[PDB]
């Protein structure tokens, strides 16, 4: 047992960035005495189920495949955690719409950074993902990453598709927010009309009062657009991450 562990760190530093920013294995929700043994169990389960490929490899390659796997395993983490980062987006552009974290939208020092509705959506979508083939899909996505550039390959990955990532994450977030956001703006423009026809009121306070509750009411009568983006995302991460490399 000397060659057993040189294959073990190469799977560690591919899968340890998969737990960092995957918001049901790290929002500070598992202890740092759990991350290291959970990865040393999952990695030991992967390299005895035969889900690797020989590179016939030593004499310059201890820290050399370190920086390799971080450029690969992060790319596995990023297209795998796209929906949660939409819902953690779609919480924010709902509660910064109604003014929850509008305290820190002026002086970002002593107010709200990680708010109270975005954490609710970020756990709720993690649960809805996690029932519907949660850890199976992630772990076969790890073997799909192993199908392309296992741990000894060159990983000369295609460029211009990880640069459209963040506009994908913005486009889906604004489109998915669109039933909530435009009615809040219709309400606030209508109350601006009311402030024009009565130029003495506090339009800001009266705007906040109705415009928080109306947002939480519109999130309630949705019932439809919560789960069915993840079949799209199943086919998506089978397609995108295949054509990223």
């Amino acid at each position: 047992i000397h060659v057993f562990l040189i294959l073990l760190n190469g799977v560690f530093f591919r899968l340890a960035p998969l737990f960092f920013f995957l918001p049901f294995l790290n929002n500070g929700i598992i202890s740092p005495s759990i991350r290291i043994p959970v990865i040393f169990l999952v990695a030991s389960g992967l390299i005895t189920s035969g889900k690797v490929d020989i590179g016939s490899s030593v004499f310059e390659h201890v820290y050399f495949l370190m920086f390799k796997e971080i450029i690969v395993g992060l790319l596995l983490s990023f297209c795998l955690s796209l929906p949660f980062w939409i819902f953690h987006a779609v919480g924010s552009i709902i509660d910064n719409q109604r003014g929850a974290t509008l305290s820190s939208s002026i002086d970002p020092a002593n107010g709200v950074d990680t708010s109270e509705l975005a954490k609710f959506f970020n756990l709720f979508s993690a649960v809805v993902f996690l029932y519907s083939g949660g850890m199976v899909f992630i772990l076969e996505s790890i073997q799909l990453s192993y199908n392309i550039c296992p741990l000894f390959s060159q990983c000369s990955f295609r460029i211009s598709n990880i640069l459209t990532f963040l506009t994908l994450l913005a486009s889906q977030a604004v489109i998915l927010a669109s039933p909530v956001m435009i009615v809040l703006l219709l309400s606030e423009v209508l109350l601006g009309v009311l402030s024009r026809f009565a130029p003495q009121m506090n339009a800001f306070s009266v705007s906040l009062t109705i415009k928080s509750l109306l947002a939480i009411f519109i999130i309630f009568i949705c019932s439809s657009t919560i789960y069915f983006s993840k079949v799209q995302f199943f086919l998506g991460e089978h397609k995108f991450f295949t054509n990223l490399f």
């Binding site: 202890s31 169990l41 003014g99 929850a100 509705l117 850890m135 009062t209 928080s212």
Partner: protein, 189 residues
Amino acid sequence: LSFFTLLPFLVAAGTCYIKFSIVFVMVRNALGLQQVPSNMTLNGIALIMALFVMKPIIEAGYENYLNGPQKFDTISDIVRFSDSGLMEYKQYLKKHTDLELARFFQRDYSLFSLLPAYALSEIKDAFKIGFYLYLPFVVVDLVISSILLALGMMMMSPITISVPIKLVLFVALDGWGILSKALIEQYIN
């Protein structure tokens, strides 16, 4: 100094520790309390509770460890001890691991190919339960935020004010007692 150090965590990975040591950590993050039920405290409470759950597994496996004879210190004999020397923790693993995730660590199961499947199954299940616990602490959190923005005051954060209400909701619930009872009755019937 890793196998000298992380072996009390590798062994305590995939017994029952994960199942508690997320949920308590997910109850602390649910109350708005960012640090105060200290991490080195809650990872101790979860450890002693999980070792209580594992004690009738541990001594009755140590009986099979002790009578033996079980010549050791090689690869094949420890694999033989993992099935024909334990025989009841493996049934404990088969009880709580998914019939669709333990098949992933394969090519009538063994032992070493269920511990990652068991660890991820408990991360899955503990995250389910921790979301159900998080779920009535955001009704109070969003009610306080809504009636606090509705009462003019926007700049003051509800993280300061909600914690008395998120604890008068929680100690009157009986709190860690009814939670730990309802969470340990899954493992001790």
